[PDB]
Amino acid sequence: SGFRKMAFPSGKVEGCMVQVICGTTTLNGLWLDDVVYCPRHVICTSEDMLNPNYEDLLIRKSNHNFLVQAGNVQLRVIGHSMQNCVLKLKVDTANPKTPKYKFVRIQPGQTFSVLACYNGSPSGVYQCAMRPNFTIKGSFLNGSCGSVGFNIDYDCVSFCYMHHMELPTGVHAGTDLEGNFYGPFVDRQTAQAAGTDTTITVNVLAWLYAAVINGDRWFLNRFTTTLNDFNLVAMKYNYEPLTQDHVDILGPLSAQTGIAVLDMCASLKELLQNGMNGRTILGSALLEDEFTPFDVVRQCSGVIFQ
Amino acid sequence: SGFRKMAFPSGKVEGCMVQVICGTTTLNGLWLDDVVYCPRHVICTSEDMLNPNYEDLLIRKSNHNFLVQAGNVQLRVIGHSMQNCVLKLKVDTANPKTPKYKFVRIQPGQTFSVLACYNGSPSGVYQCAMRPNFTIKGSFLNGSCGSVGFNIDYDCVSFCYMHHMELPTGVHAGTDLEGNFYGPFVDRQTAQAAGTDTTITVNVLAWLYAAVINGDRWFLNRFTTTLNDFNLVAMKYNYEPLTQDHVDILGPLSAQTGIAVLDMCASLKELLQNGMNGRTILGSALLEDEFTPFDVVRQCS
């Protein structure tokens, strides 16, 4: 009953948030076992960031230079090392709250929850999607660096994102928890451009299935379309071309609603050319692409008449 | 930068979530200290909730019927009770993960985070607004009865909502943590009239400031207007009348941007009158009333 953009419960991730201080720089860290993971730019100063030699700057830093706070308790840094763009600080105490975890690399189109933190304190949680241009449309401010993205699958927390920087366009950039950036970005103060952002069509189709499940059918029409002649409209409107694996992923939602995938593609084609003409789908005046088919199934779980 | 609908970190509330069972009925409970709060219809089954007598059903039940579970560990009931529409079950074990909390009753227009739960297990966290007609734009499935709505102030979790019934008409009904329903709803499964829904004007004007702070300012005009003139336009589009108390709250937002309260009213008046004609504000092609001035300040400060 109802459809909302929902984040995963953040509890398991809050128990891991710590504050990391290095000289004049303060950001957030993720305490898993006796290792703290944080953006490696923490070892820099604004001047360093113009062209930082992270290897040379990491030589000059010692275990004493890193101040880690888990609430009011201080943690002893007994070792340090760098892995791509992430700094790994080995602490003396293991985090008793370390959940069952794994470092995963999500694909563009996929969603995750973000826990925004300031000075090692959780502030809020929101659901995000990895845009096809490898940026996120988030809400982060000074001190948010080190804030993580994650999904929860049963008892396991899959960490997939760590916030590093904001791009001139207002969008955000970061790495997986192995330090590897998503997209063509670098942790260096240089002119950077996000790229062209296409709309995630598989997600838009999923959202239209969620709208039908919640009683919105004005957009449904007698017309049908082919996969090939839909991708032609998708080229004009900057929508991703629909692959066969994506059509199959929409199988369960198609089977439930009894609307064939290409009949939903015809409705999508019509909304692109003619527009919504004042009407709203799920109370939104625009087509939403930030819900994966799995997110729709998670809330719009219904029966299938085979 | 960027403006997102954010929910409060739900960790302090996840530690309070237990699975409450009574008869062949299973919902969620909120375990705070040695008391577990849950919707009183936990005593009822799929055949009692048409029009039941909750007073005579509470007499018929003893502490052996109620089985409170906190995950792997089981809780034993040491005294059932009832305040308004909520059921308070006393327990032997006090909740070790009980955070500093308070029970509040939110007013229409105010927001809170909902932690959705199924069989005592948390599923997702989303931010809701209490509509003027006392309804919530929620997402709840079966077994979500007893899911709570809250606000987090530093360490203090203010619990303001408990999910009771999903109306046949669609919308969701619930009480405060004292058991008093929000609006004209009862714990009986029947078609109940939600009411007339106005747009929360104070929340739209706060959202217009959030857009200005985040670089969106095409909607801004040189023009200005008085309360009496704006309140006339407010009636035409189903918008809440702007009170003088509504003006005082928007002060810090106005100070941060430079645009005075009455100046932003003149932009809203024009946006309602002409529309947007292709353009969007904060990535939305519609005006947003789900963000209080405090929610906008929370993110943009």
Author numbering:
A (entry chain A): 1 to 306
B (entry chain B): 1 to 301
Text lifted from the article:
Severe acute respiratory syndrome coronavirus 2 (SARS-CoV-2) encodes a main protease (Mpro, nsp5, 3CLpro) that is essential for virus replication. Mpro cleaves coronavirus polyprotein 1a and 1ab at 11 junctions with a conserved Gln residue at the P1 site, a feature with no known human analogs. The essential function in coronavirus replication, together with the absence of closely related homologs in humans, identifies Mpro as an attractive antiviral drug target. The SARS-CoV-2 Mpro inhibitor, nirmatrelvir, was found and developed as the oral COVID-19 treatment Paxlovid (nirmatrelvir/ritonavir).
The crystal structures of the Mpro mutants with the greatest reductions in susceptibility to nirmatrelvir were determined in the presence or absence of nirmatrelvir, including S144A, A173V, A173V+T304I, T21I+S144A+T304I, T21I+T304I, and L50F+T304I. The T21I+T304I and the L50F+T304I double-mutant Mpro apo crystal structures showed that the enzyme C terminus was bound at the catalytic site, presumably preventing nirmatrelvir from binding. The T304I mutation alone reduced nirmatrelvir susceptibility by 3.4-fold, while addition of T21I, L50F, or T135I each slightly further reduced nirmatrelvir sensitivity, resulting in 3.8- to 7.9-fold reduced susceptibilities. The double-mutant enzymes T21I+T304I, L50F+T304I, and T135I+T304I either had no impact on Ki or had a lower fold change, consistent with the lower fold resistance of the corresponding mutant viruses against nirmatrelvir in culture. The T21I+T304I virus acquired a nsp14 exonuclease I87V mutation, which existed in the T21I+S144A+T304I triple mutant that appeared in later passages, further supporting a stepwise selection. So far, the combination mutations with >5× in vitro EC50 increases identified in our in vitro studies are not represented in the GISAID database except for <10 instances of T21I+T304I of >13 million sequence entries analyzed.
